[PDB]
């Protein structure tokens, strides 16, 4: 229980500090084909 | 003749099963062990280290310091083994607010003779004779004189205290060091002092154990001339919308029961617009449409309520500072209604008997033959069951393990018929006169043994029918 709203900000090598531009760690935006693992909390996609 | 009575039947003989699936998937009802539970850690409690000053028996007006510096003080700062732990299965959420509705001066006109003595008191639920000046001492706004209409909240309506859309308030901290804080000063103060007619107040619930929200307002009714009345209408609210494998199961069976009242809709207006029209003196076509008008309710709003419900929970962490986080009482006054009207229905739907007669209960209550012809089984079949159980006791006494204890072979022959056989050992014991004792038993339970019930069975049916037969063709 206890979920929440994904992340989909940018981070860093550790974790977030964007200091000078593009997060060395990006998003890498999710497709619209193929997705829909559905696993055990919730139905999950092919973002992170 | 032909074709309504195979057609219609079936169709709701369908809808009925299709309806209590969904029945058995709403029937949660853990409200027995997540409300009742929570409702004795919070209104079952001593005040004091032992008295009768309980929430089930208030203690006294001026018992302020004692009433909230008690129970309610341990659900701010509830330690266990400031702070959320009472037995270990509820937590705390939103912030505390507590409404003191005091009922100032303007109870009753002062005139110049008798003013002296007494003319402001705890009166009936005013506008000019609420809390006009300080309720008691209070520099400031400790007892706030203010009418808070614009606080967003509608009156109750209560019966045994009338409540209005104004009123003295205050909310609390994140903590209790603040909220005891203020309760002291409110008691060295007066806040809730004599004038105070009746004290509300509102509170929410995680309960991380088994997830769900608790909604719960109290009300004491301190009677001006004497007593307290308590009030405590507690009730949980949940969304499981989709993690699971079997409330999908639940949503299709949902759009199963859509379509069928879609089907029943469609069908009901041309029995009106076709067929002829104003006839209604049947009380069966009645129910026809009732049944369906209920029925579109509870689908526009199962659907909105989940939507708020949904939109409510995803701002549950803004709170922990924030002001007031008691808006949610507009939710339940529709979930208990959609609790209400479900069952509204659901009897009414199955309260159809235009398939077959319901003074003919005569045929469900003589079935009591087949009870007795039950009991005369029962004593037939023990016999031989218990002679089985002393051979295998004897013979088998000593070596097996299983038939060791004669409360034990009882166990084991149960075991034999749910097929859970062994026979390793069974016959290892003794070579001969054991295996004959499994393949007789066999060879009488499962075939001469077992059939005798199912005939009786089938027997009961047949004369049922017959009955039946007989006196609906006389």
């Known amino acids: ?48 | 003749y032909l074709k309504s009575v195979l057609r219609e039947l079936v169709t709701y003989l369908l809808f009925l099963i299709v309806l209590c699936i969904l029945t058995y998937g709403m029937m949660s009802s853990n409200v027995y062990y997540y409300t009742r539970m929570m409702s004795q850690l919070f209104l079952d409690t001593p005040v004091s280290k032992t008295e009768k000053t309980n929430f089930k028996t208030l203690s006294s007006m001026e018992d302020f310091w004692k009433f909230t510096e008690g129970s309610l003080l341990d659900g701010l700062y509830w330690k266990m083994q400031n702070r959320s732990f009472i037995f270990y299965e509820n937590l705390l959420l939103g912030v505390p607010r507590i409404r003191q509705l005091r009922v100032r001066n303007g109870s009753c006109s002062i005139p110049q003779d008798l003013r002296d003595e007494i003319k402001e008191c705890y009166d009936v639920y005013s506008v000019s004779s609420e809390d006009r000046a300080p309720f008691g001492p209070r520099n400031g706004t400790a007892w706030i004189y203010t009418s808070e209409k614009d606080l967003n909240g509608s009156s109750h309506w209560g019966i045994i205290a009338t409540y209005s859309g104004a009123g003295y308030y205050l909310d609390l901290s994140r903590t209790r060091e603040e909220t005891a804080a203020q309760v002291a000063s409110l008691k060295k103060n007066v806040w809730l002092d004599r004038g105070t007619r009746a004290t509300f107040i509102d509170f929410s619930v995680y309960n991380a154990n088994i997830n769900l929200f608790c909604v719960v307002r109290l009300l004491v009714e301190f009677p001006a001339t004497g007593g307290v009345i308590p009030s405590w209408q507690f009730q949980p609210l949940k969304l499981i919308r989709y993690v699971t494998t079997f409330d999908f199961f639940l949503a299709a069976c949902e759009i199963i029961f859509c379509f069928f009242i879609f089907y029943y809709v469609v069908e009901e207006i041309l029995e009106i617009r076709i067929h002829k029209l104003h006839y209604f003196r049947s009380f069966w076509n009645c129910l026809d449409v009732v049944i369906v008008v209920l029925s579109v309710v509870a689908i526009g709003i199962n659907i909105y309520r989940t939507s708020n419900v949904e939109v409510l929970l995803q701002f549950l962490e803004d709170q922990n500072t924030f002001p007031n986080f008691e808006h949610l009482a507009y939710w339940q006054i529709q979930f208990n209604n959609i609790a209400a009207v479900t069952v509204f229905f659901v009897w009414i739907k199955l309260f159809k008997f235009i398939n077959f007669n319901r003074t003919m209960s005569q045929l469900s209550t003589t079935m009591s033959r087949c009870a007795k012809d039950l009991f005369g089984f029962a004593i037939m079949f023990f016999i031989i069951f218990l002679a089985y159980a002393q051979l295998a006791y004897l013979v088998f006494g000593t070596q097996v393990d299983d038939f060791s204890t004669f409360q034990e072979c009882i166990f084991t022959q149960f075991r034999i018929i749910l097929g859970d056989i062994n026979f390793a050992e069974i016959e290892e014991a003794n070579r001969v006169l054991g295996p004959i004792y499994f393949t007789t038993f066999v060879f009488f339970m499962f075939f001469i043994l077992l059939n005798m019930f199912l005939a009786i069975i089938n027997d009961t049916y047949s004369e049922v029918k017959s009955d039946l037969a007989q006196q609906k063709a006389e």
Request: aromatic residues 16%.
């Open chain 1, 1 to 48: 229980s206890a979920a929440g709203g994904f992340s989909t900000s940018d981070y860093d090598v550790g974790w977030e500090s964007p200091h000078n531009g593009s997060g060395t760690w990006a998003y890498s935006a999710p497709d619209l084909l193929g997705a829909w693992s559905w696993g055990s909390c919730a139905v999950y996609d092919s973002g992170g």
